[PDB]
């Protein structure tokens, strides 16, 4: 058994971490005080859920997790929230002036003054790990802290843990729920500085979570709360193989060896069905074939884009609920004949499959209905590059006039770091084009 430390940075990261660690407790039967009636081994155990929790002789289970923000407002609600007893204080790190939507201020100015303290607090969890695998890092692309501090942290984690793995859950900017006009700048900046330091990034486009919340959950104006419960199921789907018994995706290195052949292209598209409204009165339950078919509808993707016009390099189907291999293969064979699934030449057309017979746990009183079977598909399609196109185009419009650049340069950044970052993204977009057309 090998532990995973989770780091949530900025507002989106902290609020999503609250969503996940709440779910994670409902899944594993851990009350809001750290007490799990099941862990008969009081104080220890190399179980599958100990990759995310450590125990204490007191009997408390406490997340291998650290929360970090350049402002106390959001993390202060974890301090006084229903799950306060879960985390000890050392794990909740608050600065005083946030980055004001400004990467250069989270990376350089205010970054520089808290990076050391954070790294120390992470070395306190790494120290209680018999065999650390690495890190899951949740953050927005668009925030000042989320983009700027995260990329500093990511650089430092590669020098202090050069052998360990780093995964990203990254929120991609969308205007319906934006906070800043500079989110395109902060995205391309943080993607560039992090690209070499990250092994696998699950990008979740807030546009997509918002429309899913609108179409299928019948929320008229989704809030962060709506969005974050939908995002936490997706996250839970991805991490369940590290917290439960199984043979698929059992360590962090297997995420790279199963989803990422080429190192730079490491953004798997995530697709998820069924999302069914809790207060939908009569609902006919969806079969294995039905939910597996929906994995290939862009309307269920965490990033809106068209995989028919790209190529797959890999593909995982994570089931949860009443699924048997027989019905999976059946559904696959019908789907292959109805849909456009092109793999790259140098990769086997196939699907690694994982089934967890426990049906998806649902937040009591939330917006999502219980179901008998759910699937999260993880495919590395070149099609996700459309998302980089969109973002690079918006970046290109503003930078053509150097609009807002003075807010960065004023903070110590250099106008050339903008064009260095953009040329990288220009490279990445091209890498996708060679692999895919």
């Amino acid at each position: 058994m090998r532990e995973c430390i989770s780091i949530h940075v900025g507002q989106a990261g902290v609020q999503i971490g609250n969503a996940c660690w709440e779910l994670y407790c409902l899944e594993h039967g851990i009350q809001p005080d750290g007490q799990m009636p099941s862990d008969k081994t009081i104080g220890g155990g190399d179980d599958s859920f100990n990759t995310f929790f450590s125990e204490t002789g007191a009997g408390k289970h406490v997340p291998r997790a650290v929360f970090v923000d350049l402002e106390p407002t959001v993390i202060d609600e974890v301090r006084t929230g229903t799950y306060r007893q879960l985390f000890h204080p050392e794990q909740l790190i608050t600065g005083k002036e946030d980055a004001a939507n400004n990467y250069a201020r989270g990376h350089y100015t205010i970054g520089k003054e808290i990076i050391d303290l954070v790294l120390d607090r992470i070395r306190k969890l790494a120290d209680q790990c018999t065999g650390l695998q690495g890190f899951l890092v949740f953050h927005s692309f668009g925030g000042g802290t989320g983009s700027g501090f995260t990329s500093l942290l990511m650089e430092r984690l590669s020098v202090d843990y050069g052998k360990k793995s780093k995964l990203e859950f990254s929120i991609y900017p969308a205007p319906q729920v934006s906070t800043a006009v500079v989110e395109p700048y902060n995205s391309i900046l943080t993607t560039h500085t992090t690209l070499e330091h990250s092994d696998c990034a699950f990008m979740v486009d807030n546009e997509a979570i918002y429309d899913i919340c609108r179409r299928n959950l019948d929320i008229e104006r989704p809030t962060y709360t709506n969005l974050n419960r939908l995002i936490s199921q997706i996250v839970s789907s991805i991490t369940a193989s590290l917290r439960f018994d199984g043979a698929l995706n059992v360590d962090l290195t297997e995420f790279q060896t199963n989803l990422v052949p080429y190192p730079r292209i490491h953004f798997p598209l995530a697709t998820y069905a069924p999302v069914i409204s809790a207060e939908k009165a009569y609902h006919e339950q969806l079969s294995v074939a039905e939910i597996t078919n929906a994995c290939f509808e862009p309307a269920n993707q965490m990033v809106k884009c068209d995989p028919r016009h790209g190529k797959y390099m890999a593909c995982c189907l994570l089931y949860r609920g009443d699924v048997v291999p027989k019905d999976v293969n059946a559904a696959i064979a019908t789907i292959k004949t109805k849909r456009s699934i092109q793999f790259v030449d140098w990769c086997p057309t196939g699907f690694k499959v994982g089934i967890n017979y426990q049906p998806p746990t649902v937040v009591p009183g939330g917006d999502l209905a219980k179901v008998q079977r759910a699937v999260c598909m993880l495919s590395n399609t070149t099609a996700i590059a459309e998302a980089w196109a969109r973002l690079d185009h918006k970046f290109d419009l503003m930078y053509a006039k150097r609009a807002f650049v003075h807010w960065y340069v004023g903070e110590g950044m250099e106008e050339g770091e903008f064009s260095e970052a953009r040329e990288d993204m220009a490279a990445l977009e091209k890498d996708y084009e060679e692999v895919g057309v």
Binding site: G246, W346, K352
Partner: protein, 54 residues
Amino acid sequence: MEVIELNKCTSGQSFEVILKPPSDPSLEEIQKKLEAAEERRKYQEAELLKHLAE
């Protein structure tokens, strides 16, 4: 077609299914950049404060 590597357990199972076959900066360099932007921040604030002294 071909179903391989099937591992079953009490909690679930896992397998693959094949349809067709195929056809870092150092700590020194990081402290350098961080301090180099601190110098530009200082230089600019001191041009400001100088101007304000005129």
